Design an enzyme around this catalytic site. Structure first.
Site, PDB file in Angstrom:
ATOM      1  N   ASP A  86      83.533  79.214 -18.268  1.00  0.00           N
ATOM      2  CA  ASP A  86      82.473  79.512 -19.225  1.00  0.00           C
ATOM      3  C   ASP A  86      81.156  78.921 -18.742  1.00  0.00           C
ATOM      4  O   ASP A  86      80.894  77.728 -18.929  1.00  0.00           O
ATOM      5  CB  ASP A  86      82.850  78.932 -20.577  1.00  0.00           C
ATOM      6  CG  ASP A  86      81.808  79.205 -21.634  1.00  0.00           C
ATOM      7  OD1 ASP A  86      80.913  80.024 -21.387  1.00  0.00           O
ATOM      8  OD2 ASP A  86      81.899  78.597 -22.717  1.00  0.00           O
ATOM      9  N   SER A 146      65.027  88.360 -17.214  1.00  0.00           N
ATOM     10  CA  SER A 146      65.126  89.701 -16.671  1.00  0.00           C
ATOM     11  C   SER A 146      63.764  90.383 -16.745  1.00  0.00           C
ATOM     12  O   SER A 146      62.966  90.128 -17.646  1.00  0.00           O
ATOM     13  CB  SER A 146      66.174  90.494 -17.457  1.00  0.00           C
ATOM     14  OG  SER A 146      66.192  91.862 -17.104  1.00  0.00           O
TER      15      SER A 146
END
Length: 330
Positions: A35, A199
């Site tokens: 994770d 992004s």
């Protein structure tokens, strides 16, 4: 040193991936959920409340000659999906794919929430976010990667998650045969303890690319792709009959639909998520309403590039003094 381990989807939807981890001496192999959005290595154990164990493999520290109670240390964690676990702490030898760390904090669960009990395939979590998020008290502990870093050939790990197939976690090296083209690296903020990046935009299907900054985290422990409501609405508007269902908890779509791809930007590069990766199947057995793999982050407080996005790429988690992320197509 290096390590390399195969990671395997837990079910036919890729809801999560499990990676075998050797703990203790002799080794006890547990299948952990790696994770990158958390920083605790915790396991089902011989200390876990018996009624909260249902098919998981447990770590028994008393059977490990290298286990040592970390005196006074406790841990307690709550995840973004509302699940939680807590317990005490041992140090022990932990190996992943041939890479060994001695003295790793292994957090033994005394209690786990129902969602963990109900998932027999996941024996615990191995956190790969920054150690500033580790919950051990009163002495915070380091992640497996943090402990291994100095010994690694290069201070990196890579995630290569499969679509409906196994993939690979590598430690200490870049497998240049595992991706196409080049890896585009992008800046990371560690201020929230995550692999947080920005992004450069998105496209829906064959549509034009929208240049827009989307801050979010690279999180292998989250199944889906959680993005701003504007972006998510633009995606599902291209699927006839798709709608947000408050009762189901997100966007659903007719199972008869063919889903468009979704592209996200990494600098000037582009990662394409095929439409099929966005199908999470019937909302309940036999239903013709299917659950979408792109959902709004509006109720989270952060955008999350979970497995739906990451499995479309070869992803480099560069843990150099100034960390960065790399993405390549594959």
């Amino acid at each position: 040193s290096t390590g390399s381990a195969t990671t395997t989807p837990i079910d036919s939807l890729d809801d999560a991936y499990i990676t075998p981890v050797q703990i203790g001496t002799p080794a006890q192999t547990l299948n952990l959920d790696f994770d990158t959005g958390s920083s605790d290595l915790w396991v089902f154990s011989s200390e876990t409340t018996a009624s909260e164990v249902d098919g998981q493999t447990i770590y028994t520290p008393s059977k490990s000659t290298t286990a040592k109670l970390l005196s006074g240390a406790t841990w307690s964690i709550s995840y973004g999906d509302g699940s939680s676990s807590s317990g005490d702490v041992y140090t022990d030898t932990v190996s992943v794919g041939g890479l060994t760390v001695t003295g790793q904090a292994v957090e033994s669960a005394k209690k786990v929430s129902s969602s963990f009990t109900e998932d027999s395939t996941i024996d615990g979590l191995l956190g790969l976010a920054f150690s500033t998020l580790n919950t051990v008290s009163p002495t915070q502990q380091k992640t497996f990667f943090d402990n291994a870093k100095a010994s690694l050939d290069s201070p990196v790990f890579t995630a290569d998650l499969g679509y409906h197939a196994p993939g690979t976690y590598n430690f200490g090296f870049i497998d240049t045969t595992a991706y196409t083209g080049s890896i585009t690296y992008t800046a990371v903020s560690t201020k929230q303890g995550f692999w947080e990046w920005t992004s450069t935009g998105y496209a829906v299907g064959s549509g034009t690319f929208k240049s827009t900054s989307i801050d979010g985290i690279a999180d292998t422990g989250t199944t889906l792709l959680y993005l701003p409501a504007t972006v998510v609405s633009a995606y599902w508007a291209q699927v006839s009959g798709a709608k947000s269902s408050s009762s189901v908890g997100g966007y659903v779509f007719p199972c008869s639909a063919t889903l468009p791809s979704f592209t996200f930007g990494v600098g000037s590069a582009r990662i394409v998520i095929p439409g099929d990766y966005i199908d999470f199947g019937p909302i309940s057995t036999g239903s013709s309403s299917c659950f979408g793999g792109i959902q709004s982050s509006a109720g989270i407080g952060i955008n999350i590039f979970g497995d739906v996005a990451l499995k479309a790429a070869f992803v480099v988690f560069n843990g150099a003094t100034t960390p960065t992320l790399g993405f390549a197509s594959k």
